[PDB]
């Protein structure tokens, strides 16, 4: 009946975005504007209305292919944020995440300790999470791309961004305590 606190959870997410904030563009596009992406994420719940969540976009290669494909060297990336949601129903709930994505790459280093370009652009998300069955949860959330860098006076209205859907697992049933 009552909610839980001081617990952890893990899952996977997959969504599509209208347009990315990339700088190197050299493609016409599959249809018009939509890029599907997959990844994994997990989080810890501190209280009924205050929790934490982290995530990172995995990668998949094709062992059966002899084509030159490179981009970075010893590079890594991860995202860390806080989750804030409200319990509308025992099974249906709403949540919002706010944090930042950390990105780092390697490019010529003489063991001196210097950087050229790091990724630290705070981001947030919004959606709802529902429980279909024990040890199995599913939720959908969206992200805003037009709301950073510089505030626009007039033009397009903020009513469309990133659309994603992922599943999450909650561990910590117990019996007494």
Swiss-Prot record:
Question: What's the impact of mutating residue 71 to R/V?
Answer: Becomes partially sensitive to phages K3h1, M1
Q: What is the effect of changing residue 139 to A?
A: Higher channel activity; channel is open longer and more often than wild-type, conductance does not change
Q: Which organism is it from?
A: Escherichia coli (strain K12)
Q: Where do the TM regions start and end?
A: 7-17, 35-46, 50-58, 76-87, 92-100, 122-131, 136-144, 162-171
The range of the complete sequence contained here reads 22 to 197 of 346
The effect annotated for residue 69 to K is: Becomes partially sensitive to phage M1. Increased resistance to colicin L
Reported function: With TolR probably plays a role in maintaining the position of the peptidoglycan cell wall in the periplasm. Plays a role in resistance to environmental stress, and a role in outer membrane functionality and cell shape. Non-covalently binds peptidoglycan. Acts as a porin with low permeability that allows slow penetration of small solutes. A very abundant protein, there can be up to 210,000 OmpA molecules per cell.
Topology class, membrane: Multi-pass membrane protein
Instruction: Specify the domain of life of the species encoding this protein.
Output: Bacteria
Q: What is this protein called?
A: Outer membrane protein A
Q: Which residues lie on this side of the membrane: Periplasmic?
A: 2-6, 47-49, 88-91, 132-135
What is its subcellular localisation? Cell outer membrane
> What ranges are annotated Extracellular (topological domains)?
18-34, 59-75, 101-121, 145-161
A GO CC annotation given for this chain: cell outer membrane
Task: Specify the effect of residue 109 to F.
Answer: Becomes sensitive to phages K3, K4, K5, K3h1, TuII*-26, Ox2, Ox4, Ox5, Ox2h5, Ox2h20, partially sensitive to phages TuII*-46, M1
Carrying O3-poly(beta-hydroxybutyryl)serine, the residues are 164, 168
Entry annotated with the keyword Transport: yes
Q: Reproduce the UniProt comment on modification after translation.
A: Hydroxybutyrylation on Ser-164 and/or Ser-168 can add up to 10 R-3-hydroxybutyrate residues; it is not clear if one or both residues are modified in vivo. Hydrophobic residues adjacent to the modified Ser residues (i.e. Leu-163, Leu-165 and Val-167) are important for hydroxylation. Hydroxybutyrylation occurs in the cytoplasm. Hydroxybutyrylation is required for stable pore formation, unmodified protein may not be able to insert into the outer membrane. Further hydroxybutyrylation occurs in the C-terminal fragment (residues 285-346); this modification probably occurs in the periplasm.
Gene Ontology terms for molecular function: identical protein binding; monoatomic ion transmembrane transporter activity; porin activity
Query: What does the record note on quaternary structure?
Result: Monomer. Homodimer. Interacts with Lpp. About 10% of the C-terminal periplasmic domain dimerizes when expressed without the N-terminal domain. Interacts with F plasmid-encoded TraN during conjugation.
What is the first-listed, main subcellular location in coarse terms?
Answer: membrane
Please describe what happens when the gene is knocked out. Answer: Double lpp-ompA mutants are spherical and only grow in the presence of electrolytes such as 30 mM Mg(2+), and are sensitive to hydrophobic antibiotics and detergents. The peptidoglycan layer is no longer attached to the cell outer membrane which undergoes abundant blebbing. Decreased efficiency of bacterial conjugation of the F plasmid. Deletions grow poorly on SDS, cholate, at pH 3.8 or at 5 M NaCl. Grows very slowly in the absence of NaCl, wild-type growth in 1% NaCl. E.coli is no longer killed by human neutrophil elastase (ELANE) in vitro.
What are the entry keywords? Cell outer membrane, Conjugation, Disulfide bond, Host-virus interaction, Hydroxylation, Ion transport, Membrane, Porin, Repeat, Signal, Transmembrane, Transmembrane beta strand, Transport
One GO BP annotation here?
symbiont entry into host cell
